[PDB]
């Protein structure tokens with residue numbers, strides 16, 4: 001009850017900033033998450049024993065893959081913490097509760113393979129979930145862990161509040177399917193520009209939370225350059241292993257997943273910044289002005305990839 005989590009001074013200050021990196025000490029990440037819940041939600045949001053048990057069962061259900069691992073889960077939750085703390089009064093009590101949990105759980109039991117590889121392999125999950133295959137699985141794994149004995153962190157909510165928080169989590173996790181991002185952002189662009197965007201409209205709040213989820217999920221592009229650049233190594237280590245597995249099924253992978261085309265990474269990064277990342281943070285900044293530092297950091301990193309192409313690094 002009177003038991004706050006506290007961080008060393010450097011972490012206490014830098015965790016408030018969008019570009020914070022959670023460090024290489026895996027044993028500090030649970031404490032960092034509980035710290036973020038306590039400040040963004042409250043010390044009363046969750047029973048500490050139940051929250052601690054939930055966190056450790058979530059950790060156990062992330063795999064030892066290069067990128068889609070427990071460090072990614074906590075990194076994506078931190079970017080959501082920074083958005084929530086910079087937009088104090090815009091979000092409901094249930095949204096605060098649901099969204100950090102959603103971020104921690106959003107890639108549960110990821111195998112390091114895309115939806116497209118599961119469909120080509122004919123994985124059983126591709127028959128159970130025909131679209132957003134991995135994301136339906138991540139939500140299914142989240143409900144499983146919530147139903148373990150002593151893992152119900154939402155136990156104090158009414159039956160209808162419980163259904164509402166699980167619906168926030170489900171939509172927030174499905175929104176992390178990048179295939180769905182393009183259309184969501186275009187609709188938000190039109191709504192903002194014609195002045196029809198209304199944050200009391202539930203279907204509009206859903207779209208804005210979906211964009212927050214894309215923004216948090218892609219947040220490696222908003223870090224200091226050395227973090228951005230070293231995270232890109234882990235991203236491609238997964239993609240290139242998927243490309244190898246495409247070659248084993250007798251399918252030429254796309255260049256993004258073919259280790260033989262490593263030389264083209266710098267130009268592939270430019271495409272990605274221009275087609276996905278910069279548009280994401282641009283629309284997010286229009287809707288939520290205090291998220292502008294994410295956009296500024298993304299533009300700084302585009303400029304670094306442009307230097308790499310010019311042979312200036």
Ligand SMILES: Cn1cc(-c2ccccc2)nc1CCc1cccc2nccnc12
Nearest residue numbers: 220221235255256261264265268269271272
């Ligand atoms: C599009 N695209 C193409 C290529 C490419 C590379 C090599 C040869 C040919 C094409 N790389 C990307 C972006 C990779 C990428 C994908 C998803 C999330 C990412 N989040 C951060 C940084 N990158 C991310």
Ligand SMILES: [Mg+2]
Nearest residue numbers: 106107134176
């Ligand atoms: Mg994912």
Ligand SMILES: [Zn+2]
Nearest residue numbers: 106107176217
């Ligand atoms: Zn993710």
